């Protein structure tokens, strides 16, 4: 909601991964958690994912 | 022209993913203009993730 995406990104949680998956799966704005799990992905050098 | 496109890319992912985006697409797009273009657009997408 913050729209601090960066900050998000660099969160080093052990949930985060699948929240979005869920968020993307079951929110209305697919686009907005989709994109955002692919940068996390990208992120962590999970490129096939991304 | 494609190492000068690779050089500015990385002056934007070094708004980060955005940057690697906008790279990604300026590689796809010298790609389709010209195989071992897009073979260097797409490997270059692979290199920067």
């Given at each position: 909601q913050?729209?601090?995406t960066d900050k998000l990104l660099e969160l080093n949680s052990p949930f985060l991964e699948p929240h979005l998956v869920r968020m993307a799966k079951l929110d209305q704005n697919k686009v907005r958690y989709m994109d955002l799990l692919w940068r996390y992905y990208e992120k962590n050098r999970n490129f096939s994912n991304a | 022209t494609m190492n000068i496109l690779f050089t500015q890319y990385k002056?934007?992912?070094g708004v980060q993913e955005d940057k690697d985006s906008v790279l990604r697409?300026?590689?796809?797009?010298?790609?389709?203009?010209?195989?071992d273009t897009?073979?260097?657009?797409?490997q270059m997408e692979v290199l920067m993730n």
């Open positions: 913050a729209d601090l | 002056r934007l992912k697409s300026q590689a796809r797009a010298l790609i389709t203009f010209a195989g897009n073979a260097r657009l797409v």
